[PDB]
Amino acid sequence: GMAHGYFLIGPWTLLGPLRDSEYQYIGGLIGALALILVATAALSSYGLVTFQ
Amino acid sequence: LGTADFMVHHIHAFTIHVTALILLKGVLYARSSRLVPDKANLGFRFPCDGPGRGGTCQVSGWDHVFLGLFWMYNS
Amino acid sequence: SHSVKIYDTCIGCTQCVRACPLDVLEMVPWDGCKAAQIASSPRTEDCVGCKRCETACPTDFLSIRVYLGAETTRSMGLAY
Amino acid sequence: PYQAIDYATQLSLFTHHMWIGGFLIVGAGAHGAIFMVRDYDPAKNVNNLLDRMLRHRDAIISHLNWVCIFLGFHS
Amino acid sequence: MDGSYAASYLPWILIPMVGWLFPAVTMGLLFIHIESE
Amino acid sequence: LSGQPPKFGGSTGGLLSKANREEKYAITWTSASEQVFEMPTGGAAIMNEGENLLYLARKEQCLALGTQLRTKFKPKIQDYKIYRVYPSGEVQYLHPADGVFPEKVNEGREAQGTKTRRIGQNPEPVTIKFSGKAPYEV
Amino acid sequence: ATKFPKFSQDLAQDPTTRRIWYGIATAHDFETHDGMTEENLYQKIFASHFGHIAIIFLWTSGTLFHVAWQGNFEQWIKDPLNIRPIAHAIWDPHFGEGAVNAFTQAGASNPVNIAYSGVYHWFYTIGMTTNQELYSGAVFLLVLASLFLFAGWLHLQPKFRPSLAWFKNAESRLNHHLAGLFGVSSLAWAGHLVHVAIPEARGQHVGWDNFLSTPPHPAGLMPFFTGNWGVYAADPDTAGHIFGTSEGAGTAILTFLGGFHPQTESLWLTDIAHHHLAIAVIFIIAGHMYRTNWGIGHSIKEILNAHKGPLTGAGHTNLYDTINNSLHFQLGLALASLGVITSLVAQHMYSLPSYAFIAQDHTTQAALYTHHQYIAGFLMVGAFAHGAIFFVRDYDPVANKDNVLARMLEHKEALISHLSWVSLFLGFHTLGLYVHNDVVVAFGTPEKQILIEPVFAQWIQATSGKALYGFDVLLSNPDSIASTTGAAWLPGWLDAINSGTNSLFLTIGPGDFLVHHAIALGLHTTALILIKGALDARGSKLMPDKKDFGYSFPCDGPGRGGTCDISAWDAFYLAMFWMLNTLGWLTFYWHWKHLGVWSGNVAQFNENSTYLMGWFRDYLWANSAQLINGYNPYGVNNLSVWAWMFLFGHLVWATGFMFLISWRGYWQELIETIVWAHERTPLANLVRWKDKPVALSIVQARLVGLAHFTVGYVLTYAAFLIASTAGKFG
Amino acid sequence: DFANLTPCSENPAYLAKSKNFLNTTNDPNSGKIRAERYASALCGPEGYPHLIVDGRFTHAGDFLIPSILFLYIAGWIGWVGRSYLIEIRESKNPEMQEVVINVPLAIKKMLGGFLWPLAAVGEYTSGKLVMKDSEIPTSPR
Amino acid sequence: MDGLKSFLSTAPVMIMALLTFTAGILIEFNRFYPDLLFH
Amino acid sequence: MALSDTQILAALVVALLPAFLAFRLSTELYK
Ligand code: CLA
Ligand code: CLA
Ligand code: CLA
Ligand code: CLA
Ligand code: CLA
Ligand SMILES: CC1=C(/C=C/C(C)=C\C=C\C(C)=C\C=C\C=C(C)\C=C\C=C(C)/C=C/C2=C(C)C(=O)CCC2(C)C)C(C)(C)CCC1
Ligand code: SF4
Ligand code: SF4
Ligand code: SF4
């Protein structure tokens, strides 16, 4: 998680829609925070399915 | 060469690679595959091996040339 | 598992068994034709459904018929 | 002489020799596959380049499958 | 995105709910349902 | 199931995770000479002298080899046994089931799938709408 | 192993991804579920009807709610010819400042979508004038959807579950649907029109607060009960009446005026009220025809058994036992009859509009005709598709011995080959005359075109009253017995049929002749795939036991020469392209002829539609100009979403070509490499699928490729239809 | 009556365009001959001849004379192809006569096809034109 | 020579012989009598 | 003229009544 969370703000920081506002690092974080939240939901739904 | 020349060259790199994908898979899997392991006895130019195994439609090496011609047209 | 059915118009020339790639079909003794044998399908659990037997059948309409039923791992022909 | 200012000739000569060349590349995938069905003898092809190409078809095609999906998404 | 209509705060929350929260719950619950024993 | 494996350099077309989870298939044959055969999973391997043991992913791959072992060699290998191998160690012997090749008629074989009527003498689907049975079943 | 799908044990132990796909497509095929009885088939169908009805009511409520909330309905009724009707608000976080400014249109303060469904013209004509009335209609339809959602649950309860004999009571259902659902509902709609819609058209607000106090007529119901029905027609609205005000207004509630209101360019609401009341009386009388419980009336079995002649053998014997036992026969009769009348809705709403100022909203009438013809195109193909499902499943050759159904099977070779003849006879010549006209126009000689005046359809325009063609017959001749009968429609009808400012009976020429024969080619060939799908459904010479394999199966193998697309489902699948091609031809014809009628340049159509290049250049290339400039490097406008949708529909239509041209075992061998790649990739092989990844089945991507073809067909044309019309007139 | 049409001799759009008719063939007055021939037709708003196919003998040359000329020749092609196909199916090898044409038998049939309507009426009366439906290979319904 | 006559009497050659003769009629009719839209 | 904030919010509370009855119908039809 620490490895995947660390580079994931990178694409939205430098290439996201907020990259030319004053909230470039904020909009890069919320993009990657919401990506991890889907990613942990993809993990936990997989584990409920695969090991039952 | 600008940004539009970058994008259309990678389109050309894409569509050549698919035409390379269809035709090389038709050469390598001409004899056999995990789907139909006896395609060498069926020939080069056969339709299929029936609706079985889910459907073995266009498994022959002829049909990769058939699909590669469209992707050559597209490329 | 598919259903492989053999009908009474069989002439027993064994072409469905030789066309079978999954060892589904075999020749059993019978009294209804000159060759005195009818095709049988004891191993339709291994039936992929590819209908090579129906291609090899010379009678009209067909003496062997493959009906695509429920799909298993063996009938879908998966190595995975 | 005077080819480069005839924009019709420059467009047609590029296009015709594109299409002729693309058609012949697809025929390479054809007669590559016809060789494998008909003229490929495994007795004299043991551990050579062609036997080893057949021994990692899933390595070649799936990476070629990947680079087509990569290029299609990124062009 | 603005609005002169009343309850203009409602498309502020319903668009990311129908857009995101409704499919992530439904396809989340469908993925458990279609893949359970 | 005793037998040395044929001399093969390895391939990507062989066993996947199905072989160690659901089932795999073993073909066992006896060869007179050290000969080259085309693997049904891609590539060419060499038959060992004597008994050979080859594990394959599908029953079709074993029978594609057994078809090749019976018609693509100057001495025909007509003694190949085909097994279904389970991860629990139990082995089900498949082909040939009665020890006789199935294109030859053998006594003691019972008829399965025979229906004693024509293919046009099947009943209509309207008569069996909610019985759940197909026109070829009942 | 898996509990999905619960209705199929053959699919429940499928280890692959085909289980998920086939669980979706066999979900509504209730007859083939495991353990399905006959009465529980009808009871699950009955509650599915209740659920579908409430989805319609929620869809109408959502249309009513969003016009009341985010629309400009009170702003639009004060100038219906100028204000663009707003469908709903756009809330898209992807919008930049260009697209916010582009879609902030129709006098709104936010990005909005312009309504092209025509509901504003519909709501204003039926008396609605405030957003409170539309909101009250939406909340009531939420309640009306609740009363139908609960009723489906209630009729699934074992106390209120209806018996099989109740579902078989055809005489009671036909009496109650005709006298009730067709009759009372038309009587109640005429009741709404005379009470609410006609006085609100005449400036008098009639609502729920005061409709019991004011009467629709000053004379009351006493002329109705005394037989003096002409009081309700006296003092109609004159030609100087303004919709929504009392200036020039009459007092009549039921007129018989014939043609159009002059300002709105639609039918008189008093004619519309009189039409609904007249058909209500006829429908209530028609719902007293069948014998339900009082001895009088007809038995439907008795009528069908008596109707037999010498040329059809047994005639209509045991058709009551065939239709009432087959749900697919009833569905195929229902989809065909809805398919006819939805086309009739399309062909009558453009020529006889009934909603106020809808004849001036050109993009609405464009979108309304094309939507109803595309729906009717679906309903006609599915009628024949379910006609084939009936022959596979529900047809008994023993009970239908020598009746009209079996004799269609008996001469099915003469039916298909003559349909094959008519299609070839039409298509060799309609294409033959267009390609002739294209070449001679290309060769500098457009006078060498073979141009046929459509004399037979111009004659019918004359027999309804159009004297433009010089035929003096029936209604164009003022001295005939049809003209001199003293019909009260005739001064209003003859004024509307000869004005030329409407679309009532448009002037037709050689371009109209040639495209009706393409339409005739389109209807016959689409039928030809469908009757051959219906009658070879049971079997054919290549596959006699096709009824054993069912309706929707892939093939019979490559043996016997090859059996690709041999199922009756595949002739549904092939006729879907031909239906879209027919609908592509007729809606191109409707749009291009109306583009010249609305702009006044009728000579653009009449001199370029005779050859396909004028169709290609003056219609497809010319009218797509403002569409494809919906966005450009120099900005955006309100056609930016239609420009994106136009290219979206090109992508979906072309993606369907992949599933229709490339076939299965190419992709199954491709997936097997991808399956190998996942299994041998570290950090990813720890993730494993539960369902084995397989290719889509042979039937499935024929459906999936067709669905992409159809969604790609429709979203392409609806973008082009709207942006070319709203870019030119809107 | 065709009041929406005009004769091309009195059609003003035809008259301004018949003076610029392009020569289709090597004759330099081909467009002037076409201007004289197309003047007798019925023209629309832009001076092109609109043909009338309803059955009027005034416009019999529009469709009926093309109809009589087509159906004679197309009935001739259909009859001599039918009569060749019946003649070759009585031979030892009827299959080879279609891929390898018995050309003197074909010329003999083709020249005799000028009396195809009296021959098709005669074969219909004799019953050899139409086969009985119970004597035909038929699909299994 | 006899087998050359059989080759000239094949279905491809004779349909190319007939269509050339048919196009020979139609071109030579439209060269001396062009522009026949009606009779 | 325009709808109010309490009218839009009341319609959503009324819309929970078809939301609950469609849930009851869907689970009844699944049975
Ligand atoms: C325009 C039409 C179209 C499109 C979209 C596709 C798409 C595809 N073709 Mg192709 N193909 C077509 C027509 C088309 N085909 C036709 C006409 C034929 C019949 C002859 C074929 C036959 C065929 C063959 C025989 C082969 C392909 C392959 C492929 C893939 C190319 C590699 C890849 O993944 O690129 C990346 C994907 C794309 C470029 C598609 C667009 C993706 C968009 C940009 C993504 C947008 C985001 C997404 C929608 C967000 C989700 C939102 C949510 C609501 C769902 C891809 C899936 C090859 C393949 O699978 O090899 C890998 C292959 O071998 N095609
Ligand atoms: C079926 C009709 C229908 C349709 C297609 C629309 C469509 C839309 N609505 Mg909605 N709406 C409807 C019913 C409808 N509505 C009803 C009757 C109400 C009154 C209570 C609302 C209340 C409403 C609000 C308050 C909002 C929307 C908004 C919107 C937009 C985005 C989707 C969203 O956030 O939904 C949110 C919708 C709800 C929370 C309630 C809708 C409940 C309906 C009845 C469910 C319909 C289910 C359907 C019939 C079942 C078929 C499904 C099938 C396809 C499988 C879009 C224009 C947003 C908007 O205006 O964006 C600018 C927004 O903020 N709508
Ligand atoms: C008078 C009594 C009565 C009435 C009002 C109805 C009415 C209804 N029943 Mg019912 N029925 C009755 C008694 C009655 N039933 C009896 C006694 C029997 C027992 C024998 C049944 C047994 C029965 C069954 C078995 C079922 C029905 C169904 C239906 C529904 C038809 C579907 C629908 O939405 O219709 C809509 C129809 C109309 C609005 C009128 C017809 C419309 C046609 C197509 C043309 C109209 C054209 C016009 C221009 C449209 C204007 C539109 C406007 C926007 C411009 C409808 C609600 C079905 C259903 O859906 O169940 C819930 C169902 O399957 N009924
Ligand atoms: C522009 C495309 C187009 C064309 C012209 C055809 C043509 C035709 N379709 Mg269709 N079809 C198409 C697209 C098309 N279709 C597609 C996209 C689908 C979806 C898969 C189908 C589905 C389909 C089915 C399922 C059916 C038809 C049928 C037919 C016939 C309809 C009768 C007719 O008009 O014949 C007259 C017109 C023509 C034959 C057009 C060709 C005229 C040519 C140009 C002149 C003759 C050339 C000559 C042979 C010499 C060529 C020389 C060359 C080799 C150098 C005819 C063969 C039906 C049929 O065959 O029954 C009769 C049938 O059942 N089609
Ligand atoms: C001379 C032989 C001949 C005759 C008399 C028939 C007769 C029939 N054809 Mg046809 N047909 C033939 C050739 C023939 N056909 C061949 C060669 C083919 C392959 C192209 C077909 C394909 C075919 C179709 C696909 C259809 C017909 C149909 C029919 C009927 C309508 C008439 C018509 O114009 O159809 C139209 C016929 C064509 C477009 C093909 C004609 C091909 C050429 C022009 C005919 C002559 C060629 C031959 C080599 C001449 C031999 C000369 C001899 C001296 C060597 C009629 C029963 C229709 C039907 O069943 O309706 C009841 C129908 O659907 N036919
Ligand atoms: C005592 C009695 C009688 C007297 C009755 C009296 C004194 C008054 C009766 C009034 C009645 C019975 C009114 C009925 C109204 C029905 C309505 C209003 C139904 C609407 C249904 C739908 C589905 C509409 C949906 C929509 C809405 C909501 C919109 O807002 C617009 C879109 C649209 C789709 C149109 C009579 C003399 C008879 C005889 C003896 C019995
Ligand atoms: S379908 Fe194939 S595997 Fe099954 S019985 Fe026939 S030949 Fe054998
Ligand atoms: S089914 Fe066909 S192939 Fe098999 S024994 Fe009978 S006749 Fe021979
Ligand atoms: S659908 Fe495919 S597998 Fe089936 S018969 Fe046709 S070509 Fe063969």
Distance CA G175, CA G178 (A): 6
CA–centroid distance, G383 to ligand 3, in Å, is 19
Structural Rg of chain B based on CA atoms = 16
Enumerate the domain spans of chain H: 1-141
- Contacts of residues D46-51 at CB distance under 8 Å and 24 or more positions apart, as own/partner, are D46/F36, D46/F44, D46/F46, D47/F9, D51/F43, D51/F44
Distance CA G145, CA G54 (A): 4
Domain range for E14 is: 1-37
Residue of H76, H77, H109 to mutate, ligand 5, most atoms within 8 A of C-beta: H77
* Parallel/antiparallel/unpaired status of strands H50-51 and H42-43: unpaired
Cross-strand bridge partners of residue C26 = C40
- How many CB contacts within 8 angstroms connect chain G with chain I? 5
Distance CA F51, CA J19 (A): 70
| Contact residues of ligand 9, CB 6 A cut-off | B 47-48, 50-51, 55-57; G 554-555, 557-558, 562-564, 663, 698
Torsion of CA H64, H67, H72, H76, to 10 degrees: 180
Task: State if residue C17 touches ligand 7 by the CB under 6 angstroms criterion.
Answer: no
Distance CA H73, CA G561 (A): 36
Domains of chain I with bracketed CATH: 1-39 (1.20.5.510)
Strands (DSSP E) found in H8-134: 42-43, 50-51
Residue G453 DSSP SS3: coil
Give the Å distances, CA to CA, from G247 to G188, G198, G203, G358. Answer: 28, 14, 8, 21
Distance CA G538, CA G551 (A): 9
Distance CA H32, CA J23 (A): 80
Other CB atoms within 10 Å distance of the CB of residue G252: 24
Under a CB-based contact definition with an 8 Å cutoff, are residues B33 and D54 in contact?
no
Residues contacting residue G677 through CB under 8 Å, at least 6 positions apart: D58, D62, D63, D65, D66
Residue E10 DSSP SS3: helix
Distance CA G563, CA G568 (A): 12
Task: State if residue G127 touches ligand 6 by the CB under 6 angstroms criterion.
Answer: no
CATH 1.20.1130.10 for domain G2-729, yes or no, is: yes
Residues contacting residue E3 through CB under 8 Å, at least 6 positions apart: E11, G70, G89, G91, G109, G110
Residues contacting residue G515 through CB under 8 Å, at least 6 positions apart: G585, G586, G589, G609
* Residues of chain C positioned with their CB less than 8 A from the CB of F105: 12, 27-29, 36-37
Does the annotation list C10 as a binding residue? Answer: yes
Distance CA G659, CA G667 (A): 10
Sign (positive or negative) of CA dihedral G265, G270, G273, G277:
negative
Interchain contact J9–G (C-beta under 8 A): no
| HSE-CB for G354 with a 13 A CA cutoff | 19
Q: Is the preceding peptide bond at G5 cis, omega within 30 degrees of 0?
A: yes
Report residue B38 as tokens. Answer: 């006896």
How far apart, in Å, do the first and last CA atoms of chain F sit? Answer: 42
Sign (positive or negative) of CA dihedral G321, G324, G329, G332:
positive
Rounded to 5 degrees, what are φ and ψ at F115? Answer: -125, -10
Q: What is the DSSP string of G25-48?
A: HTSS-GGGSTT--HHHHHHHHHHH
How far apart, in Å, do the first and last CA atoms of chain C sit? Answer: 18
- Is J3's CB within 8 Å of E10's CB? no
The vertex-G388 CA angle with G387 and G392, nearest 5°, equals: 120
Q: What is the DSSP letter of I9?
A: T
Distance CA G598, CA G620 (A): 17
Distance CA G463, CA B73 (A): 55
Under a CB-based contact definition with an 8 Å cutoff, are residues G393 and G304 in contact?
no
Distance CA H16, CA H24 (A): 19
CATH 2.60.40.1170 for domain F1-137, yes or no, is: no
Other CB atoms within 10 Å distance of the CB of residue G125: 24
Containing H97, the helix (H) or strand (E) segment is helix H96-99
Distance CA E3, CA D64 (A): 50
Other CB atoms within 10 Å distance of the CB of residue G362: 19
Containing G579, the helix (H) or strand (E) segment is helix G568-599
List the F81-85 sheet strands across, edge first: F50-56, F24-31, F81-85, F91-95
Does the annotation list C33 as a binding residue? Answer: no
The vertex-C73 CA angle with C68 and C75, nearest 5°, equals: 25
Q: What is the DSSP string of B3-65?
A: HHHHHHHHHHHHHHHHHHHHHHHHHHTSS--SS-TTHHHH-SS---S-S-TT--TT-SHHHHH
Choose among C78, G17, B33, G680: nearest CA to F23: C78
SS3 content of chain G, % helix, strand, coil (to 5): 60, 5, 40
Rounded to 5 degrees, what are φ and ψ at D69? Answer: -70, -35
Distance CA H94, CA H108 (A): 18
Report residue H40 as tokens. Answer: 């007798």
Chains E and J touch (3+ CB pairs under 8 A): yes
Choose among F99, F98, F120, F117: nearest CA to F109: F98
Give the Å distances, CA to CA, from H56 to G184, H1, H53. Answer: 51, 11, 7
Interchain contact G159–A (C-beta under 8 A): no
Residue written as token pair 């400042």: G97
Give the Å distances, CA to CA, from C21 to B41, C18, F57, F65. Answer: 12, 8, 15, 10
Residue G524 DSSP SS3: helix
Q: Where are the alpha helices (DSSP H) in chain E?
A: 10-16, 22-34
Cross-strand bridge partners of residue F77 = none
Distance CA D75, CA D56 (A): 28
CA distance, residue J3 to nearest chain E CA (Å): 6
Distance CA A1, CA A4 (A): 5
Annotated binding site of G for chlorophyll a: 650, 658, 666
Distance CA G370, CA G373 (A): 5
Q: What is the DSSP string of G331-349?
A: HHHHHHHHHHHHHHHHHHH
CATH 3.30.70.20 for domain C1-80, yes or no, is: yes
Q: Where are the alpha helices (DSSP H) in F6-111?
A: 59-71
Chain D residue with minimum CA distance to G680? D59
Rounded to 5 degrees, what are φ and ψ at G371? Answer: -65, -45
Using CB atoms, pick whichever of D43, D46, D59 lies closest to residue F12: D59
Cross-strand bridge partners of residue G452 = H51
Enumerate the domain spans of chain C: 1-80
Tell me which method was used to determine the 3D structure.
cryo-EM
Interchain contact F137–G (C-beta under 8 A): no
Give the Å distances, CA to CA, from B49 to B52, C56, C58, G473. Answer: 7, 13, 18, 66
Containing H6, the helix (H) or strand (E) segment is strand H6-7
Give the Å distances, CA to CA, from A11 to A6, A8, A18, A24, A38. Answer: 11, 6, 11, 11, 17
Q: Which residues of G touch C (CB under 8 A)?
A: 9-11, 13-16, 18, 544-545, 548-549, 553-554, 556-560, 672, 675-676, 679, 692, 694
Distance CA G114, CA G108 (A): 11
Other CB atoms within 10 Å distance of the CB of residue A34: 12
- Is H140's CB within 8 Å of G449's CB? no
Q: Is the preceding peptide bond at H63 cis, omega within 30 degrees of 0?
A: no
Distance CA G46, CA G270 (A): 38
How far apart, in Å, do the first and last CA atoms of chain J sit? Answer: 47
Give the Å distances, CA to CA, from G4 to C69, G24, G27, G443, G704. Answer: 18, 10, 11, 65, 21
Choose among H52, H50, H43, H51: nearest CA to H12: H43
Structural domains counted in chain E: 1
Residues contacting residue G200 through CB under 8 Å, at least 6 positions apart: G127, G129, G206, G244
Residues contacting residue G163 through CB under 8 Å, at least 6 positions apart: G39
Under a CB-based contact definition with an 8 Å cutoff, are residues C16 and C39 in contact?
yes
Q: What is the DSSP string of F31-54?
A: ESS--EEE-TTSSEEEPPSEEEEE
How far apart, in Å, do the first and last CA atoms of chain H sit? Answer: 51
Task: State if residue C16 touches ligand 8 by the CB under 6 angstroms criterion.
Answer: yes
Look at the domain H1-141 and name its fold.
Answer: Helicase, Ruva Protein; domain 3 (1.10.8)
Under a CB-based contact definition with an 8 Å cutoff, are residues J21 and G150 in contact?
yes
Q: What is the DSSP string of I13-29?
A: HHHHHHHHHHHHHHHHH
Distance CA G537, CA G667 (A): 29
Enumerate the domain spans of chain G: 2-729
Rounded to 5 degrees, what are φ and ψ at A26? Answer: -70, -45
Cross-strand bridge partners of residue G631 = G636
